[PDB]
Design a protein around this ligand. Structure first.
Ligand SMILES: *[C@H](C)[C@H]1/C(=C/c2[nH]c(/C=C3N=C(/C=C4\NC(=O)C(CC)=C4C)C(C)=C\3CCC(=O)O)c(CCC(=O)O)c2C)NC(=O)[C@@H]1C
Ligand SMILES: *[C@H](C)[C@H]1/C(=C/c2[nH]c(/C=C3N=C(/C=C4\NC(=O)C(CC)=C4C)C(C)=C\3CCC(=O)O)c(CCC(=O)O)c2C)NC(=O)[C@@H]1C
Ligand SMILES: *[C@H](C)[C@H]1/C(=C/c2[nH]c(/C=C3N=C(/C=C4\NC(=O)C(CC)=C4C)C(C)=C\3CCC(=O)O)c(CCC(=O)O)c2C)NC(=O)[C@@H]1C
Ligand SMILES: *[C@H](C)[C@H]1/C(=C/c2[nH]c(/C=C3N=C(/C=C4\NC(=O)C(CC)=C4C)C(C)=C\3CCC(=O)O)c(CCC(=O)O)c2C)NC(=O)[C@@H]1C
Ligand SMILES: *[C@H](C)[C@H]1/C(=C/c2[nH]c(/C=C3N=C(/C=C4\NC(=O)C(CC)=C4C)C(C)=C\3CCC(=O)O)c(CCC(=O)O)c2C)NC(=O)[C@@H]1C
Ligand SMILES: *[C@H](C)[C@H]1/C(=C/c2[nH]c(/C=C3N=C(/C=C4\NC(=O)C(CC)=C4C)C(C)=C\3CCC(=O)O)c(CCC(=O)O)c2C)NC(=O)[C@@H]1C
Ligand SMILES: *[C@H](C)[C@H]1/C(=C/c2[nH]c(/C=C3N=C(/C=C4\NC(=O)C(CC)=C4C)C(C)=C\3CCC(=O)O)c(CCC(=O)O)c2C)NC(=O)[C@@H]1C
Ligand SMILES: *[C@H](C)[C@H]1/C(=C/c2[nH]c(/C=C3N=C(/C=C4\NC(=O)C(CC)=C4C)C(C)=C\3CCC(=O)O)c(CCC(=O)O)c2C)NC(=O)[C@@H]1C
Lengths: 36, 647, 161, 160, 169, 161, 160, 160
C-alpha cells in the first residue's frame, strides 16, 4: 500500500549540470587555447 | 520605448502531449472528475509504463551504437564517428569531406536527437512529440541535406532498435509504430499555416504554423446536432453554460433556463441563437452586466461570445458606441451577428476560448487577454483594454516607476496602497532609469526646485504646509533663569514642535506607551537637534512595526520618503538607491540615508521639522476636484455676470 | 506578517475563543517540526551567497538573458538580479521559519508583478531562476527541509505567475 | 509570536537570523510542551480564576463597586468580569507564543486611550490582573507558575 | 495605423492650422520619394522568403545557443515560430516603408511585444539582432538593385531596434 | 536621457559588437549638424526671456486666459506659465542639442497631461503658446535650425494630445 | 556623450548650457573625425590587444589559471578573455561618446557586487584593463594614446 | 553578549526586559558551564584545528599557495594560519558571550574593506572557516558541535 508514496515520500534528486560557455565563445576558446 | 504595458503574465505553452496530460485535461475542460473512461486511459498506461522504461533504458545506453551503425551506412569516404557530438528509394551515399565539418556536426546531432525524441515518445506514451517536431521539417532540411539519405537513416535505426531489443510482440510493436509515425511525418511535406484573418480593418491578420497547433492541447469543441443522444446534448449545454457564465452554474446553484434548453435540444433555435438569448437573459445580466461598468461588461461580453478580448482601440470604441445606444441586447446582437462569430463557431458550434495555443496571437492585447481568460477576470472591475489602448498612444502616465500600486494615497496618516490581489487595478508602464516625475509644489509654483533649485529651502507662505522650527530658545538653555522661574514661556512652543515632529514621522499622534521619552528630553535639554530627533523617531521600533514591516519593501521606501522629505521620489535613480541600501544594510540605514541626504539638509535645517513639500498630480486631484474646495475657474468657462442694460 | 503560532492565535481571537483541543494540536504539530526549521535556517544562513551562485550557474549563466540585449546583461542589472534572488531566498527562509507564507504576501508579492512588468523583467526567466534555487537549496538543506523550502519558493513562483 | 519578532528584527538589519535568535526559537520549541500545559490549566479553570480574582478586587478596591465607581451595577460588574476574561485569554496567547507581542497588539496598544474614554481607572485594571496572577499561581506548580507570572507582570507593568 | 501624410495632418489638426509652406514641402518630399518606396517594396515582395531564411541562418551562426538545447529556437516548433516572427518583422517593415511612418510599426508590433516575449521566455536580444541582420540584407540588395534612394530603408528597422531593445544607456 | 550618439552606442551595445561603418556614418552626420546645433543653442541661451515674452504677447496676452476667470490671470499662475514656457524652450533646446526626443518623454511629457488636468491648465492654450515659441524661435534663429527646433516643439504639442 | 552629461549638469542647476560647456561640445564635434580614428584602431586590433593583455596577465598573475582559481580551465579562460573584449568595447564606446557614463552604466555601476557572486578577484580584472591600456598605447600614436588612456584609467580606477 | 543585546533592545523601546528575554538569559546562564566546555576544548587544541583546516584549504584551493596568490611564501602562509587562529579566537569569544556581537565588533564589521586593501579573496577566507568548522565538529561531541557550528556558520555567512 506504501507504493503510492511519490510526492509524499522522499523526493528523487535530479541532476542539473552547470551551464558551460557555448559556440558563441568559440573565438575566445580558440584564444584560450593559444594563451598557454 | 512603449509608453504603456498591458502586463506580462506567465504563458505556459504545451510543447508536447503525454497520456496523463491528455487524460486529465479532457475532464478538466469538461469540469468533471475522471470517469471510468479517463481512469482506464491511465490504468493501461501505468501498467505499460514499466515496460516503456525498459524500452528507453536499452535505447539510452546503446544510443552510441545505433547512431554509429546509422552514420556508417549513410555516409561514405572515411569515418563519420570521428567527431561525435531496408527500402532505398534512390539515395546516394554522401562524402564526409565534401559535405563539410559544420554540416556534418548538424547531421550527426540530428540523428542522435531523432532517436532521443523517440525515447521521449515511448516514455510519454504519445507520438505527439514526434508529430509536432517532424511534420514541418522536410522543407527546412531540404536546402542543405538530402531527403533520400534521411529516410534510409531512420529506416536503419528502425531495424537497429528492433534487433537490439526484440523481447515480445506486445513490446516491440510500440517501438515499430512510433518509428513508423516518425518516417511518415518526415515524408509528409510542410502543411499550410493557420491564417487568422482580421475580422475588420481595425484588427491585424495573423498566421500560425501547423506545428504549434499540434501540441498545445486542442480546446474541446461541442456542436449541437439535432440527432444526438441527450447525454452528449446535456454535455453541449453544460459547456455552453461554462462559456457564457465562466462556470457550470446549473450544477452550482441550479440556475438554468429550461425554456431555452428545450428549443436547442429539438433544433428550433441554433447555438448561435442560444448564445444570443442567453447573453440577453436576466441570468447573465445580473452577473456580468449589473456588477460591472459599461466598458468592463463589454470586455467580459467579448470573451463569452467571441471567445477573445477586444483586439484594437477602434474595436472598443465601436462596441462601446453600440452598448451606449441600445445597451446589453444591442451589444449581444452586434457580437453574435458579426463576421467573426459565424466564421469561427458558425451556427452549431459552442463558443470556445481561443488563447495562446488555439490560434495565432497578436502582440497588442497580450496581458490584457491573459487576465481575461482567467476565472479571476469578473473581479477586475477596472477596464484593462480601453485603459491600455488609450495609454499606448499617449506618453508615460502620472505613476510611480514600479506601478500604480506603489503610489500611496495622499492623506494625513496611514500607508494605504492599492492591493494587486484585491480588485485587480495594476497599471504597468515602461519607466526607464532617468525618468523624473512631475510633482506639484505645495507652496508657490515658482518655488519648485525643478526650475528654481536655489529656492529649495523657501518656506510656503500660506500656500502649503505649516513649517515647524526651533527658532525660540529651548527651556533651561542658559543659567539666566536661576533655580525658579516656574512660568517659563518658551516651553509650550518646543512641546508643540515635538508633537509636530511625531506627526511628520507618524502621520497620527501616538499613544501614551509609544512616545520615545528619552529622545524628547534630549531635544528639550538641547543635547540633540531636530534632525537627530526626526532620525530617532524614524529609527524607532514602532516605525518599523507600523509602516515598514506590514508593507511591500518599495512601498515602505516610497512612504518613508513622503514622510521624511515630504516628497514622492522623482524616479528610478532615487528608488534604486534606497532599495540597494535596504538590501545590504537594512531599514535603519535607509532612514539614515534619507536624513543624511543633501536634499533633506537643503530643505530642512538642524532645527526644521519636515513638511509636505510636493504632491503627486493624482493626490492633488483627490484634494481639489471634489464638490467643495474646487474653484470656479479650474476647468470651467467663467461668464461675467453683469446686470442687463434694460435693468 | 503572521507565523503558524500567530495564525492559530488570530483565528481564536477573531472568534473570541480560548485555545481549544484542535488549536493545541495545531501548535504541537509546529513544535514537532521546529528543531528541523531552526537547523534548516542555519544551513541557508551559511550558504547565503552559495545557493544564489549555483542557481544562476545552473539556469541563467551563458544564456540569452545574460547575453547583450538581455535583461541581465549590464553589471547594474546583473547585480539587481542577484539582489532579487538574495531577497527571494531570505524571505523564503523567513516563511520557512514562520511556517506561514504570509510574509511573502506582505513584503514580496504585494506589488512584485506590477514592478516587474513596469521594469520589463522576464517573469518566465525568474520562475526558472527560483526553480533553480529549489534544487540547490534541497541539496544542502535536506529532504524534509527541502520539501518545506520547495513549497515557499513555489509560492514566489505562483505569485509572479 | 517570538518567531515573528525575531524575523522582523532580522529583516530590519536585512540579515539571516543570528544563532542567538536561532537558539531562542529552538529552546522555545522544545520547551513548548510546558507552555501548552500552562495554557490548558488557565483555560481549564478560566471561570474559577476570574471569579476569585474579581472577588479579591472588589474587596481590596471596593470604591470600584461603590456609587461613583466605573464598575458599579450588575451590568457594569459583568463587563468588568468580561474584561478580566479578555486579559486572561490574552495571557494564554502570550504564554503559547513565547512572546508578549499578541498581548500588546490586541489588548495593550491604545489601552490608555480606551479606558480614559470609558472612564475606567487604569490602576484598578492593573490590580485585577495582579489578583488574577495570584489565583493562577495557586493552581499551578512552583516553577511552572513562576515563568507564567512574567506575562501577567507585563500586563500590570504596561497599564500601571 | 498612420502614414507620413496622416501624421502631418494630425500634427496640424491638433493646433488647428492650415497646411503651410513647411507642410507642403514635407508632403512633396514624400511624393517624390514615393516612387522609390514602392520600388523598394517591390524588391522585398520578390525576395520575402529568401531574406528571412538567410538572415535566420546568419543569426543562428552568430548566436549558436538559440538552436542548441535550452535555447528558444531548438525544436522545429520553435524554429517555425521564429521564422514566422522574422516574417512578421519584414512584413510590417514592408508596410512602414510605403507609409514612411513608424506608427504602423508601433501600433501592431511593438506595443505588446516585450510583454509577450517575457511571458513565453523568448529572448529580446537575439530578436533585435535578427531584425538588424535583415536590415543589412535589404540595404545590400537595394544597393545592388537600381534604386536612387535607399536611406529610408534603415529607418523602420532601426525604430524596431530602438523600441524593443532594453535601455543599456 | 539619450542623445544621437548614445542611441548609436545603445544599438551597438545590445547587438554585442563594435561600431561598424553604418554606425560611424550616423555619428559623422550628427557632428556635421552639430555646428548648427550649438550655434542655435547659444542664441536661445542668450535670448531666453525675450522669446517667451514675444510668445506670450502673441497668443496669451489680451485674451480670456489672462483676464479674470482664466487660468493665466493670477500672478502666481502667470509666473508659473512663464516658467512653464521657460521649461519648454529649455528642454526643446536640450532635445535639439541631443538630436533625440528621449528627454521630452522622460522629463517633459512624463505624466504632463495628468498634471495639467488636475491643476486645470488649458491644454489648447498651452499648445498654442508652444506654437508661439516655435514661430518666434524660427524667426530668431533661422529657417533651417528653427525648423529643426520646431520638430521637438511639435513633439511636446503632440505629446499633450 | 559629452552632450548628455552637459545637459544633465545644466538641468540639475535648471539653466541653459554654459558658454564653457558649449565650447567643449564645439571642440568635440570638430575633433569628431579624430576620436572615430582611435575607435577604428581599437576595433582593428579587437582580437590582438586582449590576446596580448591576456598573455601578460596570466604570466603576472598565474594563480588565475592555476587550480582553485576563478578562471581555471579553457572554458573559464575564454570567459576572462570575453570580459577583456567587453571592457575594450566599452572603452571604444567611451572614446566615441567622449564620456564615462556610456562606460559606467554598462560595466562599472555595481561591478563589485557583480563579480562577488561569480567569485572573481576584482583587483585582478583591474590589472586586466591595465595590461589592455599598455598594449593599446603600443598599437597607436602618442597624442591620441593619452586621450584613450584617460578613459582606460577610469575603468581601472572605478574597479580597483 | 546576549545579555547586552537584550539590554540595548529593551533600551531602544524604553522598556524593561520581556518575559522571553529574561528566560533566554536564564537559559544562557544555566548552560554557561556547557558553553565554557566548548571554549576549553577549542582553546586546548587550537593549534591542531588551524593547521589541519589550513592544509585542507591549501589542497582544495592551491592558487593561494601558488605564485600570484595572496599568501605566497612560508611567511604569508604563517600569516594565513594566524588569521585563522584569530578567527578561531573570535568564535571562542562568541560562544561564551552567547551572541555574535563580540565577533562583529572585532573581526566582521569592515572586513570586506580590509581584505580588499590586502588583496585577499574573502571567499577563500570564508572557506577556511568552513574547514575550521569541520575539524572542530570532529574534535568534540556532536551535541556541543551543533552549538559551536551555529556561531561558525555566521562567520562563514558574513564573510561570503
Ligand atoms: C465630457 C463631460 C468630457 C469628456 C468625455 C469624453 N469621454 C470619452 C470617451 C469615453 N468615455 C468613457 C467613459 C465611460 N465608460 C463607462 O463605462 C462610463 C460609465 C457608464 C463612462 C461614462 C470611456 C471608457 C470612453 C472611451 C470610448 C471612446 O473612445 O469614445 C471621450 C473621447 C476621448 C477619445 O477620443 O479618446 C471624451 C472626450 N472629455 C471632455 O473633454 C469633457 C470635459
Ligand atoms: C470608528 C468611527 C470606526 C472605525 C475606525 C478605525 N480607523 C482605523 C484606522 C485608520 N483610520 C484612518 C483614516 C483616516 N486617515 C485620514 O487621513 C483621516 C482624516 C483626517 C482619517 C479619519 C486611517 C488612515 C487608518 C489606518 C491606520 C492609521 O491609524 O493610520 C481603524 C484600525 C484599522 C486597522 O485594522 O488598522 C479603525 C478600527 N472602525 C470601526 O469599527 C468604527 C465604526
Ligand atoms: C534575476 C532573477 C532576473 C531579473 C531581475 C531584475 N529585476 C530588476 C528590477 C527590479 N526588481 C525590483 C523588485 C523588487 N522590489 C521589492 O520590493 C523586492 C523585494 C521583495 C523586489 C525583488 C525592483 C524595485 C527593481 C528596480 C530597481 C532599479 O531601479 O534598478 C532588474 C533591473 C532591470 C533594469 O535595470 O531595468 C533586474 C535585472 N531580471 C533578469 O534578467 C533575471 C532573469
Ligand atoms: C542531412 C543528411 C542531415 C541533417 C543536416 C542538417 N541539420 C540542420 C539543422 C537542423 N536540424 C533540425 C532538425 C530538428 N529539429 C527538431 O525538432 C528535431 C527533432 C525531431 C530535429 C532533428 C533543425 C530544425 C535544424 C535547424 C536549426 C540549426 O541550425 O541547427 C542543418 C542546417 C540547416 C540549414 O542549412 O540552415 C543541416 C544541413 N539533418 C537531418 O535531418 C539529416 C540527418
Ligand atoms: C525568432 C526571431 C526568435 C524567437 C521567436 C519565437 N516567438 C515565439 C512566440 C510568439 N511570438 C509572438 C509574437 C508576435 N506575434 C505578433 O503578432 C507579433 C507582431 C507582428 C509578434 C512579433 C507570439 C504572439 C507568440 C506566441 C504565440 C504564437 O506563436 O503565435 C516562440 C514560441 C515559444 C515557445 O516555445 O512556445 C518563438 C520560438 N525565439 C527565439 O529564440 C528567436 C530569437
Ligand atoms: C502701471 C502701474 C505700470 C504698468 C502697467 C502695465 N502692465 C502690463 C501688463 C500686465 N499687467 C498684468 C498684471 C496683473 N493682472 C492681473 O491679473 C494682476 C493680479 C490681480 C496683475 C497685477 C498682466 C497679467 C498684464 C498683461 C495684460 C493682459 O491682460 O494681457 C502692461 C503691458 C505690457 C506690454 O507692453 O505688453 C503695462 C503697460 N507699466 C508701467 O510702466 C507702470 C509702472
Ligand atoms: C502656460 C503655458 C499655461 C499655464 C501654466 C500653468 N502651470 C501651472 C502649474 C504647474 N506647472 C507644472 C508643470 C511642470 N513642472 C515640471 O516639472 C514640468 C516639466 C519640465 C512642467 C512643464 C507644475 C508641476 C505645476 C504645479 C506647481 C509647481 O510648480 O509645482 C499653473 C498654475 C496652476 C495652479 O492653479 O496652481 C499654470 C497657470 N496655464 C495657462 O493658463 C497657460 C496656457
Ligand atoms: C578575466 C579578466 C577574469 C575572470 C573572468 C570571468 N568572468 C566570468 C563571468 C562573467 N563575466 C561577466 C561580466 C560581464 N558581462 C557584462 O555584461 C560585462 C560588461 C560589458 C562584463 C565585463 C558576467 C556577467 C559573467 C557571467 C557569464 C555570462 O554572462 O554568461 C567568469 C566565469 C565564472 C563562473 O563560471 O562563475 C570568469 C572566469 N576571472 C578571472 O579570474 C580573471 C581575472
Amino acid at each position: 500500500p506504501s507504493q503510492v508514496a511519490f510526492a509524499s515520500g522522499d523526493p528523487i534528486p535530479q541532476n542539473v549540470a552547470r551551464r558551460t560557455p557555448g559556440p558563441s565563445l568559440n573565438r575566445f576558446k580558440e584564444m584560450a587555447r593559444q594563451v598557454k | 520605448s512603449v509608453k504603456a504595458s498591458g502586463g506580462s503574465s506567465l504563458a505556459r505553452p504545451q510543447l508536447y502531449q503525454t497520456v496523463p496530460v491528455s487524460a486529465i485535461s479532457q475532464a478538466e475542460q469538461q469540469d468533471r472528475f475522471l470517469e471510468g473512461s479517463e481512469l482506464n486511459e491511465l490504468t493501461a498506461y501505468f501498467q505499460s509504463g514499466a515496460l516503456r522504461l525498459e524500452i528507453a533504458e536499452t535505447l539510452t545506453q546503446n544510443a552510441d551504437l545505433i547512431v554509429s551503425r546509422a552514420a556508417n551506412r549513410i555516409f561514405t569516404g572515411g569515418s563519420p564517428l570521428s567527431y561525435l557530438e531496408p527500402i532505398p528509394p534512390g539515395f546516394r551515399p554522401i562524402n564526409i569531406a565534401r559535405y563539410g565539418p559544420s554540416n556534418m556536426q548538424k547531421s550527426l546531432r540530428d540523428m542522435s536527437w531523432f532517436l532521443r525524441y523517440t525515447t521521449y515518445a515511448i516514455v510519454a506514451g504519445d507520438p505527439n512529440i514526434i508529430v509536432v517536431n517532424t511534420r514541418g521539417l522536410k522543407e527546412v532540411i531540404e536546402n542543405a541535406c538530402s531527403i533520400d539519405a534521411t529516410i534510409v537513416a531512420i529506416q536503419e535505426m528502425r531495424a537497429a532498435s528492433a534487433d537490439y531489443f526484440r523481447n515480445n510482440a506486445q513490446a516491440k510493436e510500440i517501438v515499430l509504430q512510433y518509428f513508423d509515425i516518425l518516417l511518415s511525418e518526415f515524408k509528409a511535406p510542410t502543411p499550410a499555416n493557420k491564417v487568422r484573418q482580421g475580422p475588420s480593418n481595425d484588427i491585424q491578420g495573423l498566421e500560425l504554423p501547423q506545428s504549434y497547433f499540434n501540441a498545445a492541447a486542442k480546446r474541446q469543441k461541442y456542436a449541437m446536432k439535432p440527432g444526438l443522444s441527450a447525454l452528449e446534448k446535456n454535455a453541449v449545454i453544460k459547456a455552453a453554460y461554462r462559456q457564457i457564465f465562466e462556470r457550470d452554474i446549473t450544477k452550482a446553484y441550479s440556475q438554468s433556463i429550461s425554456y431555452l434548453e428545450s428549443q436547442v435540444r429539438n433544433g428550433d433555435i441554433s447555438m448561435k441563437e442560444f448564445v444570443r438569448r442567453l447573453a440577453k437573459s436576466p441570468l447573465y445580466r445580473k452577473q456580468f452586466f449589473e456588477p460591472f461598468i459599461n466598458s468592463r461588461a463589454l470586455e467580459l461580453a467579448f470573451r463569452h461570445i467571441l471567445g477573445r478580448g477586444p483586439s484594437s482601440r477602434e474595436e472598443v470604441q465601436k462596441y462601446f458606441s453600440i452598448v451606449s445606444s441600445g445597451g446589453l441586447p444591442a451589444l449581444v446582437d452586434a457580437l453574435v451577428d458579426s463576421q467573426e462569430y459565424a466564421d469561427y463557431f458558425g451556427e452549431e458550434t459552442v463558443p470556445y476560448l481561443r488563447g495562446l495555443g488555439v490560434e495565432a496571437q497578436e502582440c497588442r492585447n497580450w496581458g490584457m487577454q491573459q487576465d481575461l481568460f482567467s476565472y479571476s477576470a469578473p473581479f477586475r472591475k477596472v477596464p484593462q483594454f480601453i485603459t491600455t489602448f488609450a495609454q499606448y498612444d499617449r506618453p508615460l502616465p502620472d505613476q510611480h516607476v514600479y506601478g500604480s500600486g506603489n503610489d500611496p494615497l495622499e492623506i494625513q496618516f496611514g500607508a494605504i496602497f492599492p492591493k494587486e490581489t484585491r480588485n485587480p487595478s495594476k497599471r504597468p508602464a515602461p519607466f526607464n532609469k532617468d525618468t523624473k516625475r512631475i510633482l506639484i509644489h505645495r507652496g508657490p509654483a515658482v518655488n519648485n526646485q525643478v526650475g528654481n533649485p536655489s529656492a529649495v529651502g523657501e518656506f510656503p507662505g500660506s500656500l502649503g504646509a505649516k513649517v515647524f522650527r526651533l527658532n525660540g530658545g529651548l527651556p533651561g538653555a542658559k543659567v539666566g533663569k536661576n533655580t525658579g522661574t516656574s512660568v517659563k514661556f518658551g516651553e509650550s512652543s518646543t512641546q508643540a514642535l515635538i508633537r509636530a515632529a511625531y506627526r511628520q514621522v507618524f502621520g497620527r499622534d501616538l499613544y501614551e506607551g509609544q512616545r520615545l521619552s528619552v529622545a524628547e528630553i534630549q531635544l528639550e535639554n538641547g543635547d540633540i537637534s531636530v534632525r537627530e530627533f526626526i532620525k530617532r523617531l524614524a529609527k524607532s521600533e514602532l516605525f518599523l512595526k507600523l509602516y515598514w514591516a506590514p508593507h511591500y519593501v518599495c512601498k515602505a521606501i516610497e512612504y518613508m520618503h513622503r514622510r521624511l522629505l515630504g516628497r514622492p521620489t522623482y524616479g528610478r535613480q532615487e528608488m534604486n538607491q534606497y532599495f540597494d541600501i535596504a538590501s545590504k544594510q537594512g531599514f535603519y540605514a535607509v532612514v539614515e540615508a534619507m536624513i543624511d541626504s543633501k536634499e533633506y539638509s537643503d530643505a530642512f535645517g538642524e532645527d526644521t521639522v519636515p513638511y509636505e513639500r510636493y504632491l503627486t498630480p493624482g493626490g492633488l486631484q483627490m484634494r481639489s476636484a471634489r464638490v467643495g474646495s474646487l474653484r470656479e475657474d479650474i476647468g470651467q468657462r467663467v461668464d461675467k455676470e453683469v446686470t442687463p442694460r434694460f435693468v | 506578517m503572521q507565523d503558524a503560532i500567530t495564525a492559530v492565535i488570530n483565528s481564536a481571537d477573531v472568534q473570541g475563543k480560548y485555545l481549544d483541543g484542535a488549536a493545541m494540536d495545531k501548535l504541537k504539530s509546529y513544535f514537532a517540526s521546529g528543531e528541523l526549521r531552526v537547523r534548516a535556517a542555519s544551513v541557508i544562513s551559511a550558504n547565503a551567497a552559495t545557493i544564489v551562485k549555483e542557481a544562476v550557474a545552473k539556469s541563467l549563466l551563458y544564456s540569452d538573458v545574460t547575453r547583450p540585449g538581455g535583461n541581465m546583461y549590464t553589471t547594474r542589472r546583473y547585480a539587481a538580479c542577484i539582489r532579487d534572488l538574495d531577497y527571494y531566498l531570505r524571505y523564503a527562509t523567513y516563511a520557512m521559519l514562520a511556517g506561514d507564507a504570509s510574509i511573502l504576501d506582505e513584503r514580496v508579492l504585494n506589488g512584485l508583478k506590477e514592478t516587474y512588468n513596469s521594469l520589463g523583467v522576464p517573469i518566465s526567466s525568474t520562475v526558472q531562476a527560483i526553480q533553480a534555487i529549489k534544487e540547490v537549496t534541497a541539496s544542502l538543506v535536506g529532504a524534509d527541509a527541502g520539501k518545506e523550502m520547495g513549497v515557499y519558493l513555489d509560492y514566489i513562483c505562483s505569485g509572479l505567475s | 509570536s517570538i518567531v515573528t519578532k525575531s524575523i522582523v528584527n532580522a529583516d530590519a538589519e536585512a540579515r539571516y537570523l543570528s544563532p542567538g535568535e536561532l537558539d531562542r526559537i529552538k529552546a522555545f520549541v522544545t520547551g513548548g510542551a510546558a507552555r501548552l500545559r500552562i495554557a490548558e490549566t488557565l483555560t481549564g479553570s478560566r471561570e474559577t480564576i476570574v471569579k476569585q480574582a474579581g472577588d479579591r478586587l472588589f474587596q481590596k478596591r471596593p470604591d470600584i463597586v461603590s456609587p461613583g465607581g466605573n464598575a458599579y451595577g450588575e451590568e457594569m460588574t459583568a463587563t468588568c468580569l468580561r474584561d478580566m476574561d479578555y486579559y486572561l485569554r490574552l495571557v494564554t496567547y502570550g504564554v503559547v507564543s513565547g512572546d508578549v507581542t499578541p498581548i500588546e497588539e490586541i489588548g495593550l496598544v491604545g489601552v490608555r486611550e480606551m479606558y480614559r474614554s470609558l472612564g475606567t481607572p487604569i490602576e484598578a485594571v492593573a490590580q485585577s490582573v495582579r489578583e488574577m496572577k495570584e489565583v493562577a499561581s495557586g493552581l499551578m506548580s512552583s516553577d511552572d507558575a513562576a515563568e507564567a507570572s512574567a506575562y501577567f507582570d507585563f500586563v500590570i507593568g504596561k497599564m500601571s | 495605423m498612420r502614414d507620413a501624410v496622416t501624421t502631418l495632418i494630425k500634427n496640424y489638426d491638433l493646433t488647428g492650422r492650415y497646411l503651410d509652406r513647411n507642410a507642403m514641402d514635407e508632403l512633396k518630399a514624400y511624393f517624390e520619394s514615393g516612387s522609390a518606396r514602392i520600388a523598394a517594396a517591390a524588391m522585398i515582395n520578390a525576395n520575402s522568403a529568401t531574406i528571412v531564411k538567410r538572415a535566420a541562418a546568419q543569426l543562428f551562426e552568430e548566436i549558436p545557443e538559440l538552436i542548441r538545447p535550452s535555447g528558444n529556437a531548438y525544436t522545429t516548433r520553435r524554429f517555425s515560430a521564429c521564422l514566422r516572427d522574422m516574417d512578421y518583422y519584414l512584413r510590417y517593415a514592408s508596410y512602414a516603408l510605403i507609409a514612411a511612418d513608424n506608427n504602423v510599426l508601433d501600433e501592431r508590433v511593438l506595443q505588446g511585444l516585450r510583454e509577450t516575449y517575457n511571458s513565453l521566455g523568448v529572448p529580446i536580444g537575439p530578436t533585435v539582432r535578427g531584425i538588424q541582420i535583415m536590415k543589412e540584407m535589404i540595404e545590400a540588395m537595394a544597393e545592388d538593385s537600381s534604386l536612387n534612394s535607399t536611406d529610408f530603408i534603415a529607418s523602420p528597422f532601426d525604430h524596431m531596434t530602438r523600441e524593443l531593445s532594453e535601455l543599456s544607456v
